[PDB]
Structures are given as C-alpha cells and as structure tokens.
Amino acid sequence: HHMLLWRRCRAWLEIRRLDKELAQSSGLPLELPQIVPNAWNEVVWRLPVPNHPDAFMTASNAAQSDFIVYVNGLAFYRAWLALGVEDSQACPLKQDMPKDRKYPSSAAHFAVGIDSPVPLADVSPTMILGHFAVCFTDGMTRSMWLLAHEVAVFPVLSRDEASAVMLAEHVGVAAPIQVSKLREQCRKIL
Numbered sequence: 001h002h003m004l005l006w007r008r009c010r011a012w013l014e015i016r017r018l019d020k021e022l023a024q025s026s027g028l029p030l031e032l033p034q035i036v037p038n039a040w041n042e043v044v045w046r047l048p049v050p051n052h053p054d055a056f057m058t059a060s061n062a063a064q065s066d067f068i069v070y071v072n073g074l075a076f077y078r079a080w081l082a083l084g085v086e087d088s089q090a091c092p093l094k095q096d097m098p099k100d101r102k103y104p105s106s107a108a109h110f111a112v113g114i115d116s117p118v119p120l121a122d123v124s125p126t127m128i129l130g131h132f133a134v135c136f137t138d139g140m141t142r143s144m145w146l147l148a149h150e151v152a153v154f155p156v157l158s159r160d161e162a163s164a165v166m167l168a169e170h171v172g173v174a175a176p177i178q179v180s181k182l183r184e185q186c187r188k189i190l
C-alpha cells in the first residue's frame with residue numbers, strides 16, 4: 001500500500017502505543033472468557049465483546065496434546081507486530097484489519113453464536129531479528145476480528161507445553177492448561 005519506510009515507521013509507533021497502554025493497564029483486572037455449558041460435548045467459551053453481541057469460541061478442533069493459553073489481547077497484538085512488516089503473516093494495524101479479504105467470512109462465522117462457536121487459532125512463539133514474536137499455524141483472520149473488536153482476553157492453542165509456557169510468559173494472563181486436562185475438568189464440574 002505504501003513504501004517500506006512508511007510501513008516500518010507505522011508499526012514502530014503502534015508498538016510504542018501498545019507499550020504505553022500495557023504499562024497503564026498493568027495489574028488491572030481484564031474481562032476473561034467464560035467457560036460455558038453448551039449443546040455439544042466440547043469446551044466452549046463466551047467472550048464479551050465491547051458494544052457488540054457476545055462471541056463464542058471452542059477448542060473442539062484441538063488435540064489432547066495441545067495447550068490453551070489465555071492471552072492479553074494487546075500483548076498478543078504487540079507480539080504479532082514484532083513479526084515485522086514484510087512477513088506473509090505480517091499483522092495489519094487494527095484500523096486496517098477489517099480490510100483483510102477473509103474478514104467478512106470471519107465476521108459472518110462470529111455472528112452465529114453458541115450454535116456454532118469459532119475454533120481457536122493455532123499459534124507459536126518464535127524469534128525474529130533477535131526478538132520474541134508470535135506466528136501462526138492457522139487462525140490469523142479470526143485473531144484480527146477479536147483484536148479489531150477489542151476482545152480483552154481470548155484463548156489460543158499451542159503445540160506443546162514449553163511453547164505454551166513461553167507464550168504465557170510474554171503475552172499470557174495465566175499459566176497454560178493442557179487441552180486434555182481442561183476437557184476433563186469441564187466434564188467433572190459442568
């Protein structure tokens with residue numbers, strides 16, 4: 001859309017904005033996803049969405065070996081921007097996320113609700129030019145939807161415990177939990 005210098009400077013400024021927002025909101029309670037009973041036999045969260053109907057997501061597509069990390073949206077956004085501007089998985093600014101070609105399709109799925117919760121994104125910690133970043137196996141557009149709608153905290157899926165703990169370290173609001181253990185807890189309690 002513009003030149004490289006433009007795109008790098010813009011990303012830089014947004015990261016700096018996030019740095020400050022994160023520093024200000026530090027320690028304050030965020031709105032958490034809520035594990036809810038549902039018509040299926042799966043883990044489903046209700047996600048509050050500011051000035052918007054509730055969203056619902058599910059870990060139905062996860063492996064027993066996967067781990068869930070509840071992430072601070074702003075921190076996740078920042079780590080994604082740390083991928084840089086040229087990556088094929090480069091993160092658009094929030095204001096530009098709805099322009100993404102898959103975004104209407106994502107918005108449509110999110111519109112349905114508890115009858116069809118959106119499966120979690122599969123992400124991974126990584127290293128880019130000597131710094132921490134997050135990249136994707138899948139779920140980039142649904143991640144944009146959540147970010148652009150200012151969902152405060154949402155779950156994501158990670159391939160293994162160490163990767164999950166690393167994600168939680170940099171962008172998490174709590175320790176990870178293995179999908180198999182969460183499914184079993186939901187079973188025994190709900």
Ligand SMILES: [Cl-]
Nearest residue numbers: 042043059060
């Ligand atoms: Cl599930």
